[PDB]
Every structure is written in structure tokens, then in C-alpha cells.
Paper text:
Here, we present the crystal structures of human CDKL1, [name], CDKL3, and CDKL5, revealing their evolutionary divergence from CDK and mitogen-activated protein kinases (MAPKs), including an unusual αJ helix important for [name] and CDKL3 activity. [name] family proteins contain a conserved N-terminal kinase domain and variable C termini. The kinase domains of CDKL1, [name], CDKL3, and CDKL5 were crystallized using a phosphomimetic Asp-X-Glu (DXE) substitution and in the presence of identified inhibitors. The [name] structures all contain broad spectrum ATP-competitive inhibitors that bind to the kinase hinge region via 3 hydrogen bonds.
The prototypical structure, exemplified by [name], conformed to the classic bilobal kinase architecture. [name] co-crystallized in an inactive αC-out conformation with two inhibitors, CDK1/2 Inhibitor III and CHK1 inhibitor TCS2312. Their binding was stabilized by a collapsed P loop conformation that establishes potential allosteric sites for inhibitor design. In [name], the ATP-binding pocket was sterically occluded by the P loop and activation segment (αAct1 and αAct2). This forced the αC helix to swing outward, breaking the salt bridge between the catalytic lysine (K33) and glutamate (E51, αC). Second, the [name] kinase domain was extended at the C terminus by an unusual αJ helix that occupied a site equivalent to the MAPK common docking (CD) groove and, thus, occluded part of the recruitment site for the D(ocking) motifs of MAPK substrates. Instead, [name] and CDKL3 showed an unusual amphipathic helix, αJ, while the constructs for CDKL1 and CDKL5 were truncated and lacked this region. Notably, deleting the αJ region reduced the activities of [name] and CDKL3, whereas CDKL1 and CDKL5 were largely unchanged. These results are consistent with the observed structures, and they further show the importance of the unprecedented αJ helix for [name] and CDKL3 function.
Numbering used by the authors: -4 to 148, 161 to 302
Write the structure that this text describes.
């Protein structure tokens, strides 16, 4: 773990103009290339957290894929460590600012294909993201998706959280990322969030209005938790299915979203199985696009 110097970097702005906190957009004075810099460790005197930080850096160095943000170097200034990543030119929210009523069908296919490839690679290594959202789906000048801000390195948005996260189930796994992917499908097509809750309970209400009652395990976790004393989740006798909410979306798109958003985590597809879906396979999109990305 060679540490490099922060002296070669000059501040251009904050990445996202504050919406990400203290993540500095910087230029390398020697090469002209642009980076994102985030503080990683407050003090390397603390030998306990030091060891944990070095473990995480080792993972970041090994976890290399075309759809993951590139860690370039680790810098040390005094006792603090900073991670320096390749700066990626925009995010999917930038696309949606230009097109606030939704993106082009083929644009959605290309972005979801790459998100799935990136998450699938992580899953193949037993790495869960756990915090997928539009603000961490970066997009290069050439349209390559770069994922970032994995849940291994509040008023935090709950909009993409699966039911198992919302009730605090310790048995969550890879299926949380498939759920978040499902949330992205309608949002990229329609230009609005699927389930924009403002708390754990509100989020659950939004989910349940559409998708019905939770699995028994999850309802039990909710009902046994003292934090939710005095509050109940709704009985749903009449839900509002996705196709009623978005009657102009094709059946193929709705079907993909519905599979990802199964209320039972065990009945969601594996991330990699998503690429088998008609949404990607129709007209040979998938083979054609794969060959394109290589070439
Ligand atoms: N490496 C990298 N490039 C970018 N680019 C980017 C991000 C936001 C925006 S925006 N849409 O203008 O706020 C434009 C470009 N963000 N980025 C990182 S790692 N962003 C990031 C993040 F997405 C989440 C948490 C911490 C972070 F540092």
C-alpha cells in the first residue's frame, strides 16, 4: 500500500455541488486527468480501524471490472487517508434531467444491461452493493456505466430499499440488489421514482399499496420491533398493480420489473438471470450489445 501525495491535485469543485458531501473533484497537475477524492480514514493511529481500512483497500484493488469505478490511488496527508477514483463524467440523473418524462427504450436497455453486468460480477465474488440508487450509477462520456459507493466503504434515501432491509431482517442478501434494480426499470422509463417514501414505515406503505402484503417473516419482524410500537403496516385487500399505474408501459418491461420486485426475496431472480429476460433478448439486443462492448 504505497501512499501517493495529495500535492499534485487541485480542487475544481465538489462532486454534485454538495449533494454527495465532501467529495472533491480535482485535476492532476501533472497529467491533467480528473479524479474524485473522498476521505477514507480519519486517523491511522487507531490500529483497529486501520486494519479494517487496509482490508477494504485490498478488496477495492482486486475488484476490477468495466462497470465499476476505478480506484486509482490511496493518498495520505498527515494521519488521514484519502481514496482517489477516476472521475466519471455524469450520472443517470443527468440523463433524466434532459428527459424528465423518461429515457429512450434502447438507452434503458443499454444502461440496465451494464448495471446487471456490474452487479453480477460483484455477486460472483460474494459482494453485495446494498445501496444502489440513481446517484451512484455513473455514466462515462462514451456511455459506459460505472457503479460506485458500495455498502462496504439518517435522511438517506429509502426509495430503493427492499422490504427485508426496511424491517431490519439480518438474513438479507444479494436479492436486495435485484429489488433496487427493479425500482430503476420504471424510473428510467417514466422519469419518476417508483416508491418515494420518506421513512421506513412510509416506504413500506408505498411498496405494499402496489405489491400487497409482506411475507410472514417480514411482517413478524415488523410487529416484534419496539421502534414500531403503536404503528401498523397496512392490510392490502386491493393493490394498485404496476400495469394500472403505468398503463402505457409494455408488458415485457412490466414483467421484468415485477420479477425483480417480488415481495419474497427468495423468489426474485439472480442478478445474472435478468439478462435472459425477453427485455434484453428480443431482436438479439443482448448478443449484439455484448459484441459491441468488446469491440
Ligand atoms: N468517481 C466518480 N465520478 C463521479 N462523477 C459524477 C458524479 C456526480 C455528478 S452530478 N450528477 O453532476 O452530481 C457528475 C459526475 N462521481 N464519482 C464518485 S466515486 N461519486 C460518488 C458517489 F456517486 C457516491 C458516493 C461517493 C462518491 F464519491
Amino acid at each position: 500500500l504505497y501512499f501517493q501525495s495529495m500535492e499534485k491535485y487541485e480542487n475544481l469543485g465538489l462532486v454534485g455541488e454538495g449533494s454527495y458531501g465532501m467529495v472533491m473533484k480535482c485535476r492532476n497537475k501533472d497529467t491533467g486527468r480528473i479524479v474524485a477524492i473522498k476521505k477514507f480514514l480519519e486517523s491511522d493511529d487507531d490500529k483497529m480501524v486501520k486494519k479494517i481500512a487496509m482490508r477494504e483497500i485490498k478488496l477495492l484493488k482486486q475488484l476490477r471490472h468495466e462497470n465499476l469505478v476505478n480506484l486509482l490511488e490511496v493518498c495520505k496527508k498527515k494521519k488521514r487517508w484519502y481514496l482517489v477514483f477516476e472521475f466519471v463524467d455524469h450520472t443517470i440523473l443527468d440523463d433524466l434531467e434532459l428527459f424528465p418524462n423518461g429515457l429512450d427504450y434502447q438507452v434503458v436497455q443499454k444502461y440496465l444491461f451494464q448495471i446487471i453486468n456490474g452487479i453480477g460480477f460483484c455477486h460472483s465474488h460474494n459482494i453485495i452493493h446494498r445501496d444502489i440508487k440513481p446517484e451512484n450509477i455513473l455514466v462515462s462520456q462514451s456511455g459506459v456505466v460505472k457503479l460506485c459507493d458500495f455498502g462496504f466503504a439518517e435522511v438517506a434515501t429509502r426509495w430503493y430499499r427492499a422490504p427485508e432491509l426496511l424491517v431490519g431482517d439480518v438474513k438479507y442478501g444479494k436479492a436486495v440488489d435485484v429489488w433496487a434494480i427493479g425500482c430503476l426499470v420504471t424510473e428510467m422509463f417514466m422519469g419518476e421514482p417508483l416508491f418515494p417514501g420518506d421513512s421506513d414505515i412510509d416506504q413500506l406503505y408505498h411498496i405494499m399499496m402496489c405489491l400487497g402484503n409482506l411475507i410472514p417473516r417480514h411482517q413478524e419482524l415488523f410487529n416484534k420491533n419496539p421502534v414500531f410500537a403503536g404503528v401498523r403496516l397496512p392490510e392490502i385487500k386491493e393493490r394498485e398493480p404496476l400495469e394500472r399505474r403505468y398503463p402505457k408501459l409494455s408488458e415485457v418491461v412490466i414483467d421484468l420489473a415485477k420479477k425483480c420486485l417480488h415481495i419474497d426475496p427468495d423468489k426474485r431472480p439472480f442478478c445474472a438471470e435478468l439478462l435472459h429476460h425477453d427485455f434484453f433478448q428480443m431482436d438479439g439486443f443482448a448478443e449484439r450489445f455484448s459484441q459491441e462492448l468488446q469491440l
